[PDB]
Ligand binder design. Structure first.
Ligand SMILES: O=C(O)[C@H](Cc1c[nH]c2ccccc12)NS(=O)(=O)c1ccc(N2CCC(c3ccccc3)CC2)cc1
Ligand SMILES: [Ca+2]
Ligand SMILES: [Ca+2]
Ligand SMILES: [Ca+2]
Ligand SMILES: [Zn+2]
Ligand SMILES: [Zn+2]
Length: 168
């Protein structure tokens, strides 16, 4: 596992998130479900808890956008970068953005939203990239034949608990 330089982390255990907008590609229930399953992956192995805000500024602001969208790293149309997220901190830090020039899916065939979201929230929490080809934080996208096989590797658990510790 790898952390970000300077090891940014949250110095609090109760985090908030807001889904500011939604993709055309899936019903809202499917997107909500994907992000909350992605949050839950990290909750289970840490002391962190997340709660949702429907207005105002949350710690982790989640949005869908294309091309130039108000930061230093515009998206690039279909393919290539699917999404990105920022390390812990105020303002844009912690936020996760998804490229809506992708076609987001809940299945194992397209660009799966849950898998990408789980990875991106790993960044939001302070994890960088792993060399382990089995890890969630490996830098190259791929999916699975069976999503029910999905699991955090020991590497991901070790990395995140190195920031926040194990669950009480
Ligand atoms: O790394 C990224 O997020 C960069 C942009 C990027 C490049 N430097 C960065 C530094 C900090 C934050 C973001 C970036 N976007 S990206 O769209 O290229 C991207 C998105 C998701 C992933 N996955 C890795 C494998 C994972 C998996 C694991 C186990 C089983 C099944 C599936 C599924 C998701 C990787 C890369
Ligand atoms: Ca933020
Ligand atoms: Ca793209
Ligand atoms: Ca789209
Ligand atoms: Zn962005
Ligand atoms: Zn990444």
């Amino acid at each position: 596992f790898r952390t970000f330089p300077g090891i940014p982390k949250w110095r609090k255990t109760h985090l908030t998130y807001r889904i500011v907008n939604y993709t055309p590609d899936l019903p809202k229930d499917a997107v909500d479900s994907a992000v909350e399953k992605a949050l839950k992956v990290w909750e289970e192995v840490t002391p962190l808890t997340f709660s949702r805000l429907y207005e105002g500024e949350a710690d982790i602001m989640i949005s869908f956008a294309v091309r130039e969208h108000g930061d230093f790293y515009p998206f690039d149309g279909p393919g290539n970068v699917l999404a990105h997220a920022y390390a812990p901190g105020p303002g844009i830090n912690g936020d996760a953005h998804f490229d809506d020039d992708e076609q987001w899916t809940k299945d194992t065939t397209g660009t799966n939203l849950f898998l990408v979201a789980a990875h991106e929230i790993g960044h939001s929490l302070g994890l960088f990239h792993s060399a382990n080809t089995e890890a969630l934080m490996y830098p190259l996208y791929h999916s699975l034949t069976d999503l029910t096989r999905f699991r955090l590797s020991q590497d991901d658990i070790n990395g995140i608990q190195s920031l926040y510790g194990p669950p009480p």
